[PDB]
Design a protein around this ligand. Structure first.
Ligand SMILES: NC(=O)c1ccc[n+]([C@@H]2O[C@H](COP(=O)([O-])OP(=O)(O)OC[C@H]3O[C@@H](n4cnc5c(N)ncnc54)[C@H](OP(=O)(O)O)[C@@H]3O)[C@@H](O)[C@H]2O)c1
Ligand SMILES: NC(=O)c1ccc[n+]([C@@H]2O[C@H](COP(=O)([O-])OP(=O)(O)OC[C@H]3O[C@@H](n4cnc5c(N)ncnc54)[C@H](OP(=O)(O)O)[C@@H]3O)[C@@H](O)[C@H]2O)c1
Ligand SMILES: NC(=O)c1ccc[n+]([C@@H]2O[C@H](COP(=O)([O-])OP(=O)(O)OC[C@H]3O[C@@H](n4cnc5c(N)ncnc54)[C@H](OP(=O)(O)O)[C@@H]3O)[C@@H](O)[C@H]2O)c1
Ligand SMILES: NC(=O)c1ccc[n+]([C@@H]2O[C@H](COP(=O)([O-])OP(=O)(O)OC[C@H]3O[C@@H](n4cnc5c(N)ncnc54)[C@H](OP(=O)(O)O)[C@@H]3O)[C@@H](O)[C@H]2O)c1
Ligand SMILES: Nc1nnc(CCCl)s1
Ligand SMILES: Nc1nnc(CCCl)s1
Ligand SMILES: Nc1nnc(CCCl)s1
Ligand SMILES: Nc1nnc(CCCl)s1
Lengths: 249, 249, 249, 249
């Protein structure tokens, strides 16, 4: 039987590339999304056209709240409902915007940034583990966590907490044979809100080819970590950043 | 005129020792507490007997919620009300208990552990900075973040997020002359919940002296970081762990 | 034309598995060895029997000395003389023994431990780069560098320097399209000098399976890093330790 | 009886400031130097004028060689000869120049850069310990070791090795009461070679005050680490970099 994977924030960009590559490797996929309903349905159609009954969509807000554990349980439930199993969880969904220390209320900013980047991954990990071959979780981290964007405290706190989760969950789930790893992009697909001048600035900074990573290049690292070639790898975060994090100010 | 400090969770143990040492150095202190009212008021009394009106108490739950931002603002406000200035913030208050992946609901565990260890520090940092010499913030971290206690994922996530805040805030608040640093104990005052047998096991692990750090030894590192001897130090986290984090399994 | 790889200390154990796996991927290989002449020649025979003219041996002492630069030039030259190209360098050879701070002279201990683990990798990297498609270097690091073996100062210094070389060379060689990465085992094939009781002690410490990594599992990570699936990865060190480094004392 | 300290490369700049601050705290000092003979004697004169028989000089080349252990043993021996004791060792002496991967020979470059920055500190640490109250060693590291200067591979390897030594020595010497710590400047006193425009470029990168650390600010952190206020601190490296290491490319 074909293994099954949940990918959060999978309708567009990097999550989409991850879902595609997992599907091409022979996984059945749950394409989680929040607002991008059209993109999610389009992707599921494309994958199902390739192999019948191998993709479903699942809408959920991953903002922190008292109902978040239920939403995360439901996401894992949807994989079992559709495919009778859940072998891989990819924590990809992420809010990313400035929250200066000196629009949305601060409580909404905390809920969105810490919810999406850390708490939801934690609750999904809980639900994945409790519902339990080659089982693993892959968390999308950030190569630049120690050299963060100016005025992105909450996002950075989220991504640091995700490192903590990766390590804590790797340790605790090891006896269950569940591996937990991370992939840490530097610059890949640049944020849509970023200006073209700033995009070019970031590109110029990357030692390896003066260009951002393709979404597929990020996906390749995810593929490795879920594969039989990573059977002894747990609690590892693989930087995929073309040397960006090595460059001084 | 004497500088003023806010110390969270200052009624007992490490927070108490920090408040005492800051006060002995010449600081006016806000003693924040949650449940330990008797201890907080008693500490304030002891310090005020030493120097008139140099200590006030401020109660607040630092659990994450929609009122946390108001609560943190009021803690900083209490410093300005009492002393007309706030020069130092020490983020010391912390929930610490296991949250296995496989009586409190999980959403409450999230709120308490991420709130006290990360979100409250962020909001206090916001309020501290907004309301503005030698200004600085000291965050009580954990030397063992990368070798975490089994089944303490939320605690570890919170402490990882605090490292991120320490670094993000150091970067962002440097132009304002506010330094942001951390002190990371290994084993200091062992939890009251811990049995004496387990306490002794941990003591035996410490390379430097086969004993835990006194609260006063942790306080010494805080005192250094707030002092004029650390005026170029920001974004640094000083382990005070007697070599504990250096010891392999 | 098939790509060519140099593997240092390739006659036995992990180096041997790496050479075998690279050969199975379609590389021609230079088997470097120091003392294990019979094993090196036996390996070359085996690989050449598999595919004619795809394996050669090169003997060299990688101890630090005024002749080492020439020895490292010789090893790289060997690949060019046999195969007309050199696409991959794997720095695997390593001296590993205690050097207590409080029989080999200390200067010999420095020469051997810093030589094999750091200086030779540096000199080999230099010769590799100067002589220059998917070019990369993989350095065999240590997942336990920050929780080192008691009384192994020089070994640990060597492996720390190797991390530095990995990052420094990744930065400097990126514009040449040469990637530089690391693979960091925790416990793999236990040292032959280790007693059986201690071997089982280490095995029991590994969260993921309570066993050491096979040399093949280490080799799998090397294969990934040299592959087209890692084209954007440079300056990254992949732990392959089954969560060992995550375990507190 | 006043305690005694050895400071390597103490004739000028940061080493001078450390020797001066130690002397002002009440230490008798050995001022080691290599080429700066006049500056070393002039410093010892100033300190002896302040307090009689409290400063001596000691010439030694710290380049790696087969005689380096003897030189390092002699440096420690000179502290015992002059003062009858040796309480503190500060490893400050350092070669710093580019060694591009693509008229000093490479073997000289290895010997100077790895010798001064790593091997000499190891041998001095060995001799210090063997010859043995508040005993400690302070190693001068580099806050930018993970974001290294382009084409400075050997310097960077040396400073990484010094981190390894700091940790390994802290672990091993903790049972003897000898603490081993590090101070990691970002930009302090800029190389005398540098022009004013290039100096200002580096100054402008520092978040905290747009300026380099004074030698005194670095020395302050060394003073803290040797003091009674750091009695539980071992294996810690304190960045003194004004946030420099936190700034992305
Ligand atoms: N792109 C880079 O250069 C880069 C660099 C470093 C790290 N990363 C990490 O790599 C991962 C993927 O990067 P990316 O740029 O592709 O991510 P992205 O486009 O910024 O976000 C991916 C998805 O996150 C989902 N999301 C946002 N808020 C949500 C919420 N409240 N609830 C549920 N889902 C929510 C959105 O889904 P919908 O569109 O359906 O609403 C969004 O499409 C992220 O974890 C990111 O932090 C990326
Ligand atoms: N002790 C160690 O060995 C060790 C090791 C590593 C790190 N640390 C860190 O060092 C700091 C001090 O350690 P410690 O052992 O002294 O801390 P602690 O006793 O565990 O907690 C300090 C105070 O935190 C306050 N607190 C807890 N939950 C709260 C909440 N929901 N809202 C508001 N306040 C709350 C409590 O105040 P009330 O009593 O008034 O309710 C408590 O007295 C902490 O940040 C800890 O994580 C300590
Ligand atoms: N095995 C583990 O559990 C483990 C753990 C962490 C890191 N690592 C790293 O992974 C790599 C492979 O480990 P391993 O256990 O297979 O290594 P190993 O058996 O200790 O050594 C590999 C080869 O190094 C060569 N070598 C030693 N001294 C040399 C010298 N002076 N000049 C030239 N070559 C010399 C020897 O070649 P000859 O036999 O031909 O003399 C030896 O066979 C090493 O870099 C090691 O540090 C291994
Ligand atoms: N300055 C900064 O911005 C900065 C930044 C990062 C790290 N650091 C570290 O902080 C420490 C002090 O910095 P600094 O700039 O003051 O150092 P420095 O001036 O570059 O060098 C200090 C002393 O090292 C000695 N030295 C050099 N080669 C030697 C050799 N072969 N044998 C013996 N001694 C030798 C020299 O002694 P003589 O003059 O007597 O020949 C020199 O005075 C160093 O360890 C440095 O790596 C400094
Ligand atoms: N989530 C993201 N982190 N960093 C990004 C690119 C801006 Cl430089 S997207
Ligand atoms: N908050 C705390 N972290 N670690 C502690 C000592 C238990 Cl080993 S208390
Ligand atoms: N080279 C080696 N480093 N660590 C090893 C495992 C012994 Cl516990 S071998
Ligand atoms: N030894 C030194 N390392 N870094 C320095 C400042 C040059 Cl920007 S001196």
């Amino acid at each position: 039987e074909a293994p099954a994977a949940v990918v959060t924030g999978a309708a567009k960009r990097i999550g989409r590339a991850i879902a595609v590559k997992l599907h091409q490797t022979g996984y059945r996929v749950v394409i989680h999304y929040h607002n991008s309903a059209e993109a999610a349905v389009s992707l599921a159609d494309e994958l199902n056209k390739e192999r019948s009954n191998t993709a479903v969509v699942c809408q959920a807000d991953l903002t922190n709240s008292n109902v978040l554990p239920a939403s995360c349980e439901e996401i894992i439930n949807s994989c079992f409902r559709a495919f009778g199993r859940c072998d891989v969880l990819v924590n990809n969904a992420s809010a990313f915007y400035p929250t200066p220390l000196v629009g949305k209320t601060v409580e909404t900013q905390v809920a969105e940034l810490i919810g999406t980047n850390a708490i939801a991954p934690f609750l999904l990990t809980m639900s994945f583990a409790q519902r339990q071959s080659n089982l693993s979780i892959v968390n999308l981290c950030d190569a630049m966590v120690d050299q963060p964007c100016m005025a992105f405290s909450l996002y950075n706190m989220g991504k640091h907490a995700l490192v903590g989760l990766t390590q804590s969950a790797a340790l605790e789930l090891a006896p269950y044979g569940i591996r937990v790893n991370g992939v840490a992009p530097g610059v890949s697909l640049l944020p849509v809100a970023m200006g073209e001048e700033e995009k070019d600035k970031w590109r110029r900074k990357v030692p390896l080819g003066r260009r951002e990573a393709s979404a597929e290049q990020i996906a390749d690292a995810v593929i490795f970590l879920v594969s039989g070639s990573a059977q002894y790898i747990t609690g590892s975060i693989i930087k995929v950043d073309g040397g960006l994090s090595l460059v001084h100010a």
